[PDB]
Design a protein around this ligand. Sequence first.
Ligand code: OMP
Ligand code: U
Lengths: 256, 256
Amino acid sequence: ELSFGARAELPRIHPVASKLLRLMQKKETNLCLSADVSLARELLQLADALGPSICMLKTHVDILNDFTLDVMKELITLAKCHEFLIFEDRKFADIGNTVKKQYEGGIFKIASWADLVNAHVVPGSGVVKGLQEVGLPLHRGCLLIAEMSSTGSLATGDYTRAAVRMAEEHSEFVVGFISGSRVSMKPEFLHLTPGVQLEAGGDNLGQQYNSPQEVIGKRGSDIIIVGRGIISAADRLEAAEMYRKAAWEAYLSRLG
Amino acid sequence: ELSFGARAELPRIHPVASKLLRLMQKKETNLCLSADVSLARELLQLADALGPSICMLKTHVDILNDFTLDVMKELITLAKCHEFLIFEDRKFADIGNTVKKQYEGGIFKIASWADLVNAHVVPGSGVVKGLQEVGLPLHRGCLLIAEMSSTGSLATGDYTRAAVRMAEEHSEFVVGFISGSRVSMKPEFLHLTPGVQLEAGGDNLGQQYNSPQEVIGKRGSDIIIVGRGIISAADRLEAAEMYRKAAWEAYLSRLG
Ligand SMILES: O=C(O)c1cc(=O)[nH]c(=O)n1[C@@H]1O[C@H](COP(=O)(O)O)[C@@H](O)[C@H]1O
Ligand SMILES: O=c1ccn([C@@H]2O[C@H](COP(=O)(O)O)[C@@H](O)[C@H]2O)c(=O)[nH]1
């Protein structure tokens, strides 16, 4: 097992993965903030205050009541200042010809500001081929959704294996997974795990939580994605630091 | 087998399905236009000219370069005038808590103007529960993606069966399927089939085509969804009429 800093130098590493792994090592953070807010001002205030604590800020641009491309410009300023990647959790899941348009165009112009996006594998590899036509020239990366945190997820068994094969066959663009665990044995790939809180529980709409120690330490994932465990807390900075320290120590203790 | 007009009266029919089936029978159309354009003016000119020929206009609001809510008001005026449903092909595919916000909120406010949306079943039934918490109060309907037209689709076998079970257990909100074929034996459910052209072929990014006669007549689906077969033609009205007549006669001949 290699450190994040050594994985950043692997021969087959994608440049976006390398940039991420280097800043994870530098800042001692494997925390991705899930910035699940509806106001641009709250998004930017969280990005600025929590930027030093996070390796990545995950967006849902389509829930931002006051989205503009200028908001994204300000978020990029903070991402560059504090050193974190921007991941738009768009979950592209259409035919290749459609997702290329959804990624490059429309009002969001996601490819113009998102370092990372993700895709479901259920449509077959055309979803990746469509995205990569926009993303490769724009030097972007993609995560494939191999496992999901929600109750009744069908992303199990052969489905998960199909996601890993699709990633390993599109390594010029796919840099890792959304998963609950390590699903690829290739250290070039990132594993990002949502459904994370310190306390046991879930929500009323099928979300299930596991702890940072469980998903990083026992299940071998790289990065925790945390929304409400931070966002709903009174002090979001202290909450982010709790999650960062939990995920970082779980990583160190698996390393030895 | 019942006519569209008789299916509109079934005891368990959803009001959105009933409205659709009645206008399909009245206008002799089971064609859904896939309005895959980037200009509001082209979207509205197609909706106006092709409105009499279609039962439904399917949008990808996120590829419109000049989206505003006033464009959607103008589209609703045309939908009411010519009598067709608006279907936003958003393919919701996240946890329930997230999709409720993506459906109601953000810039697009999809639930405010879309009669129908669709969802992938891969996250489990929380995706439907989240949507239905916005959609039920707004008297909307949902389609579940049971099969996909693209090469390498994983929406087969047990996956398709899971989509049918999820639909039949959420019949207060789910009105049918995106599928390549009849997947439910319950006549209350609509089957809408994309990947349709008169000529054999595909695209460069995994799309596969079958004819209206194949998908309506042999595979037992209700509605054809047609994009490029119409949109890329010079005379889009004549193209829509050719697809309408093909799908309608295939339906009549299976009725006998
Ligand atoms: O839900 C959809 O309509 C959909 C499902 C599917 O299996 N395949 C599929 O192509 N679609 C959509 O249907 C349309 C097909 O367009 P054309 O290939 O140009 O006719 C596109 O807008 C797709 O996003
Ligand atoms: O399997 C997955 C993939 C994404 N997500 C997303 O991660 C976030 C989880 O937020 P939460 O910590 O508040 O439950 C939220 O934005 C979801 O849309 C999951 O929760 N599970």
